[PDB]
Every structure is written in structure tokens, then in C-alpha cells.
Design a protein around this ligand. Structure first.
Ligand SMILES: Nc1nc2c(ncn2[C@H]2CC[C@@H](COP(=O)(O)OP(=O)(O)OP(=O)(O)O)O2)c(=O)[nH]1
Ligand SMILES: [Mg+2]
Ligand SMILES: [Mg+2]
Length: 539
DNA sequence: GACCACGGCGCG
DNA sequence: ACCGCGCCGTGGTC
């Protein structure tokens, strides 16, 4: 039923392509084809063939669009059945699965991929018939967003290589003094990177009490949390905690990053995965630039490596207390809506409490602590873990949790109602109707069920914030194009932009406004904005 | 080499 | 009994 026609495909045909590797910015275009009508076209020269296309329609349209941009073209991404499946069920995350579930087999040949893209789109599209809300999200948010993401990926971000190179040599020396001392206290050397070897040393060789176990294998956990609880039991503990921090940092960022600079761009090119999350957020991959350090002194030295091009400035915008604002609007709780209507900051008020100091003295590292407290309690962390976290009696943590919800009566009300419709309907949804299926809401094992419930009621909050950031990006992007400013990174409720110094100021004001006005809620959405030569100073 | 399950831990 | 991610060594295949 499928015929083979000469390269030149009509228009509106679905593309099919094969890369040497999964990273669009580094891949080699091994093959390019197209499917339309009932015919399939294979281009003898892919790189040559790109120029022919006016749009990228089909499985993973964005990635090919990113490669096209890398080659100087301007092939923008269009329809993509992955986006439709993902909207149908966010568990639809890979072509292999989407293909197996909606009508085909994901292979390694571009003709078959072009053919697959067309039929998949037809099937998935039909099943979105009647889903006005999911269609609204398709055409208004996702499809356009892919274009935004493609440009972000090909643009990349600049990095201070020589800076990280010298940092490595420094931290290496500190790592040395650390392992060296750990070994002395243990009375002998061993692979400190080995959790199993460390386990034996701490729990068998030394007689430190075990605090928790690991999940799948039930071993005695050597986790940071376990170690913090053991800091005073032996002088070796602190040392290990510091060894842990530095090695994590050097092995994950300080060393790998400088080797990831692209030859032709001199910049770092992360990928932005559009269908990799259950709640609707994005994920950053291969270089994951959504998890660059910032919470510790060494972490900050590292963030400092992200810099703007000479003559430019980075501009970072981040929604203030995003999820608490989203929650006030979902639950409709008046005591909470007032909190924002009155300009209050809950992370500040919590951290002020925690550390017995006036708001005025709360620093960033104290606030971050307040966040895991605030977000922890809301999303159901037990008094036991909380007591540990706040370093206070068990009943004091029990009381903290009692007051929190008593303070915002409609939150619990909203939770229970979200959970109930979740059971009946099989899924929960976001403000815009992004849905997530949670079948285990009716598991008969309390353990499994209550865990599904937590996943379930967090989705609407975290998912709504995600929709908001995505819509904001769709609206902001064209405006930035016009101002000659570029959009570099999205970090969940944060955007990192690069703007010519003459225009940094104007860009900062435009972005802030677009972001705060994205979609008016029962509470205003404030955006803290910063500008600097690097990502750290930016915030 | 290339890929994995785990335990861990970076960020949101 | 916080939620959502991806990446890095170990210890182990194949
Ligand atoms: N459950 C949970 N959600 C979190 C946690 N950290 C962040 N989030 C969610 C809620 C906020 C959202 C974005 O994170 P940010 O670091 O931007 O924090 P934020 O809450 O927006 O606040 P802010 O603007 O004051 O920094 O991600 C956490 O530890 N637990
Ligand atoms: Mg924020
Ligand atoms: Mg943020």
C-alpha cells in the first residue's frame, strides 16, 4: 500500500530521519525521508535534502529542527505525534512505546520512520477528537513550544572552560586531603566511592549504629541523611560528607562540562525533552543544565562558569513561591490567597521560625531549607522525617504539620476532592486540563495507594506551574526575537536569557511582565528578576 | 566498549 | 509517608 517516489516530497509530508547519535547538535544526518499520500520519498543526500523542507512534521520534529538550525537553516518544527500521545497520557514518553501502542514499529530506517509518523499522527489525532482541552494545549502550548525549545537548543550557553579547568586541579587537591584523612581514621585505605566498602567500614569495622536501609537490596544506607545523623558519633563522618560533596561536584560538573563545548559554537548545548515527565514539566538531558549547583559555596563557584557572550548580559527570571501561589488558586483557600494579596513570603516566614532569627536575617541557604520544609509538609512528609529535618521533638513536628493545614483549611479540602475524582476518573488534571493517570489510587495495599495519592495531588500543582511556564515561553519568545535577545534555559519556573548589554534592561522588564501576566489567577504571580555577567550574579 | 540496577545526590 | 527529574561510580554482565 506504500509506494516509493523520488526525493522531492509534496508539502505537509511527514518527515522520517536517522541520526548517528541521539544528540541533535552532535549527530550526523544519516538518512532523511518523507511520507505523504500513500507514497514515501527518500532523499539520496540528507544534508542536501534538508534545504528542500519548509517544515518538520513527525516523530521528534524538534530534534531534526535543532540539527537544521545547526546547519544554518531555519526549518521550524511542526506536528509531532509524540506531543499528541504525551497529552493523552504523559506515560507516553518514547517513540518505541508510542509506536507500539498506537500503530507501528519504531525502526532504524527513515522511510519507515516517515511512514510511521504519518499514520501515528492520524491515529493519535483522531483520538484527540473531542478533547478540546487537550487540543487547546496541543496547538496553543506544546506544538509552538517545540519551536521555542529548538531555538534554545541550537543557541546554547557560553561557559568559562579555563575557569573550570583550574577549579578541577584545586578541588582535586582538597579531595586528596579528604580521602587521605578518611583512610587514616579508618586505619586503612579502601574505595571511598564504593558505598558497599564504606558500609562495612562504618558499621562493621567501626561500631557506628546503622540508621536506615536501602530499598531494593536492604543494605545499610550510607546516605547523606544517615551521615548527618552520625556526624557526632565519629570524626570520620564529617570528612566523608565533604568528600561526597566535592566528588559529586567535580565528577558531575567540573570535569564533564569543559569537554562538552561544541567546536562550531564554543557553547554548551543541552537538550530540552518535551515528553519526559508525568506532571507536564520538561527535563534537560545529555548535558542536564536544569541541575547545575547553587546551594553550596563550591556549587556557586561552578554556577559562576555560565556566562554571557562578550557585549551581552544574562537575565534570570524566576516565579516567586510559584507552587504556593498555584495552590492558593486551585484550592481557592482565602487565608492563603490573602497571604499573597498581602505581599507575604512563606519560605521567609518559615525559615525565620526555623532558625530563630528575624526575616531580615534569613539568607538563601536558610530559605532553601524552609522550602523543603514548606513543600515537604504540604506534599505529605511524616512528622518523623520532619522532626529530623527541623531537628526538633517529634511532637513539635507533629504540631507544625497540624498548624500548617489549620492555617490553610481549603488546602486539605482541595486535596481530598482531587483524590476522590482521581479514583472515579482514573486521572488528575492541571488548571489547563493536563491529565495524569494514577490507577494505583485504588490499589488495595495502603502502602502503594497512599504513595499514588501523593503523586496524584502534587501533579495539578506542579503541573499547573509547568503549563504556566510553557505558555509564558510561547508568548515571550517572539517578543525576544524582535528585540534581538535570545532565550537560553528553562529551569522549571525559571528562564535564563542572554541580551545585548544595551538592551539587557529593557529585556528584563519585558520578560518579567510577560511572565507575571501569562494567565491571571486568584493570586498575582510575581517574578524576581536579575541581571549579570554570569548565571550566579544573574539571580 | 556498551548497557544495567542501585544507591546517591545535583537541581526545580 | 514530600513530589518531579538525569547523571555518576560500583559492581556486574555480555
Ligand atoms: N515537592 C517539592 N517541590 C519543590 C521543591 N523545590 C521546588 N519545588 C517546586 C515548587 C516550586 C517549584 C520551583 O522551584 P524554585 O526553586 O523555583 O522554588 P519556588 O517555590 O518557585 O520559590 P522561589 O521563587 O521563592 O525560589 O518547584 C521541593 O523540595 N519539593
Ligand atoms: Mg521560584
Ligand atoms: Mg526556580
Amino acid at each position: 500500500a506504500l509506494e516509493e517516489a523520488p526525493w522531492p516530497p509534496p508539502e505537509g509530508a511527514f518527515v522520517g530521519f536517522v541520526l548517528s547519535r541521539k544528540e541533535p547538535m552532535w549527530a550526523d544526518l544519516l538518512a532523511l525521508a518523507a511520507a505523504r499520500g500513500g507514497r514515501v520519498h527518500r532523499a539520496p543526500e540528507p544534508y542536501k535534502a534538508l534545504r528542500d523542507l519548509k517544515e518538520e512534521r513527525g516523530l521528534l520534529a524538534k530534534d531534526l529542527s535543532v540539527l537544521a538550525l545547526r546547519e544554518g537553516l531555519g526549518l521550524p518544527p511542526g506536528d509531532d505525534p509524540m506531543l499528541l500521545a504525551y497529552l493523552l497520557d504523559p506515560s507516553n514518553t518514547t517513540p518505541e512505546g508510542v509506536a507500539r501502542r498506537y500503530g507501528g514499529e519504531w525502526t532504524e530506517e527513515a522511510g519507515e520512520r516517515a511512514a510511521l509518523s504519518e499514520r501515528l499522527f492520524a491515529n493519535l489525532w483522531g483520538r484527540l477528537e473531542g478533547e478540546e482541552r487537550l487540543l487547546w494545549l496541543y496547538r496553543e502550548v506544546e506544538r509552538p513550544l517545540s519551536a521555542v525549545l529548538a531555538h534554545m537548543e541550537a543557541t546554547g550557553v557560553r561557559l568559562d572552560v579555563a575557569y573550570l579547568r583550574a577549579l578541577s586541579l584545586e578541588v582535586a587537591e582538597e579531595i586528596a586531603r579528604l580521602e587521605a584523612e578518611v583512610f587514616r581514621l579508618a586505619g586503612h585505605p579502601f574505595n571511598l566511592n564504593s558505598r558497599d566498602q564504606l558500609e562495612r567500614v562504618l558499621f562493621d569495622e567501626l561500631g557506628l549504629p546503622a540508621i536506615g536501609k536501602t530499598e531494593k537490596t536492604g543494605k545499610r544506607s550510607t546516605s547523606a541523611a544517615v551521615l548527618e545523623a552520625l556526624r557526632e558519633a565519629h570524626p570520620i563522618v564529617e570528612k566523608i560528607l565533604q568528600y561526597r560533596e566535592l566528588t559529586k561536584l567535580k565528577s558531575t560538573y567540573i570535569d564533564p562540562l569543559p569537554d562538552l563545548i561544541h567546536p562550531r559554537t564554543g557553547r554548551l548545548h543541552t537538550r530540552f525533552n518535551q515528553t519526559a515527565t508525568a506532571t507536564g514539566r520538561l527535563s534537560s538531558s545529555d548535558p542536564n543544565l536544569q541541575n547545575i549547583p547553587v546551594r553550596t559555596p563550591l556549587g556557586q563557584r561552578i554556577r559562576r562558569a555560565f556566562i554571557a557572550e562578550e557585549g551581552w548580559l544574562l537575565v534570570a527570571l524566576d516565579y516567586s513561591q510559584i507552587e504556593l501561589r498555584v495552590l492558593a488558586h486551585l484550592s481557592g483557600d482565602e487565608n492563603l490567597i490573602r497571604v499573597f494579596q498581602e505581599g507575604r513570603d512563606i519560605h521567609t516566614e518559615t525559615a525565620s521560625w526555623m532558625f530563630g532569627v528575624p526575616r531580615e536575617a534569613v539568607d538563601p541557604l536558610m530559605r532553601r531549607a524552609a522550602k523543603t520544609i514548606n513543600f515537604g509538609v504540604l506534599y505529605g512528609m511524616s512528622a518523623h522525617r520532619l522532626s529530623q529535618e527541623l531537628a526538633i521533638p517529634y511532637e513539635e513536628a507533629q504540631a507544625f504539620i497540624e498548624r500548617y493545614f489549620q492555617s490553610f483549611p481549603k488546602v486539605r479540602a482541595w486535596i481530598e476532592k482531587t483524590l476522590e475524582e482521581g479514583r472515579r476518573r482514573g486521572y488528575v488534571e492541571t488548571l489547563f486540563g493536563r491529565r495524569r493517570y494514577v490507577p494505583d489510587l485504588e490499589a488495595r495495599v495502603k502502602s502503594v495507594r497512599e504513595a499514588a495519592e501523593r503523586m496524584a495531588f502534587n501533579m495539578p500543582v506542579q503541573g499547573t506551574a509547568a503549563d504556566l511556564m510553557k505558555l509564558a515561553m510561547v508568548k515571550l519568545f517572539p517578543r525576544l526575537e524582535e528585540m534581538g535577545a535570545r532565550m537560553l534555559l528553562q529551569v522549571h519556573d525559571e528562564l535564563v536569557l542572554e541580551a545585548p548589554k544595551e538592551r539587557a534592561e529593557a529585556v528584563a522588564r519585558l520578560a518579567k511582565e510577560v511572565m507575571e501576566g501569562v494567565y491571571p489567577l486568584a493570586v498575582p504571580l510575581e517574578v524576581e528578576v536579575g541581571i549579570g555577567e554570569d548565571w550566579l550574579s544573574a539571580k
